[PDB]
Design a protein around this ligand. Structure first.
Ligand SMILES: CCC(CC)(c1ccc(OCCCCC(=O)O)c(C)c1)c1ccc(OC[C@H](O)C(C)(C)C)c(C)c1
Length: 250
């Protein structure tokens, strides 16, 4: 059966699309305001050298911090998100931050050269830039695999916004209080998405593929958390980060 989207489901989709349009700049026009990218000689991808310099860390920390601010703004517009306690809203934001950043980075990701192209050559990011921020291949290899698999789904904007909202409103995050209310908000979003796909997505298992991307995000989140811990041991690393990054990942 292919039930039609309800008036409420149409309203939810319109709300999420508007929220995304207000919180995502597809021209990357604020990027010149971040601390500048610095790319030094590291053809060998030396862990010792990367940790010694962390040349791309100030720029990428400013990028992630900016992205987290946008995610906070988007989440506030998710129907039902405001119905949660302020404590649950924060737990959900902090626990999903890196996964939602990964999902939103997909819009600038291009399979032309496997880079995140955000304007000029200064704002063109590759695997090499992430290693220059002190990350290792255990995170980068699955991260690129994820970006390509997600890109190949050719998601409609409606599906992309629902996916981010479902990611944020997850009842299975550690420390949440009202898991049942979080689950009812997520179910309302998940049903909207399932109905949308059957009703609007032409042929040529998309919902199952999108669910699998959410599980892939969980693994990437865990690996990112391990790597952030290593990075946090580097003397003077805090100056290269931001207060928001320090709170979210600390
Ligand atoms: C450069 C690649 C990538 C990929 C997800 C990234 C993130 C956001 C992003 O843009 C999203 C769109 C911009 C605006 C928006 O959200 O409206 C783009 C275009 C690239 C990244 C950036 C920093 C990273 O490491 C961060 C590091 O671990 C700290 C947490 C220590 C700083 C990692 C692992 C990946």
């Amino acid at each position: 059966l292919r039930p039609k989207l309800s008036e409420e489901q149409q309203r939810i989709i319109a709300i999420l699309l508007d929220a995304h349009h207000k919180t995502y700049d597809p021209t990357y026009s604020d990027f010149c305001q971040f601390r500048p990218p610095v790319r030094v000689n590291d053809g060998g991808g030396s862990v010792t050298l990367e940790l010694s310099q962390l040349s791309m860390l100030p720029h990428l920390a400013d990028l992630v911090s900016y992205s987290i601010q946008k995610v906070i703004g988007f989440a506030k517009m998710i129907p039902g998100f405001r119905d949660l306690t302020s404590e649950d809203q924060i737990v959900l934001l902090k626990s999903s931050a890196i996964e939602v950043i990964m999902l939103r980075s997909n819009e600038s990701f291009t399979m032309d050269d496997m880079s995140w192209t955000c304007g000029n050559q200064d704002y063109k990011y590759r695997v090499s830039d992430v290693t220059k921020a002190g990350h290792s291949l255990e995170l980068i290899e699955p991260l690129i695999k994820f970006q390509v698999g997600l890109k190949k789904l050719n998601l409609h904007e409606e599906e992309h916004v629902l996916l981010m909202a479902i990611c944020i409103v997850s009842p299975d995050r550690p420390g949440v209080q009202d898991a049942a209310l979080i689950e009812a908000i997520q179910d309302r979003l998940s049903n909207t998405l399932q109905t949308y796909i059957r009703c609007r997505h032409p042929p040529p298992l998309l919902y199952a593929k999108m669910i699998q991307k959410l599980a892939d995000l969980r693994s990437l989140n865990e690996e990112h958390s391990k790597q952030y811990r290593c990075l946090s041991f580097q003397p003077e690393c805090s100056m290269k980060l931001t207060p928001l990054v320090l709170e979210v990942f600390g």
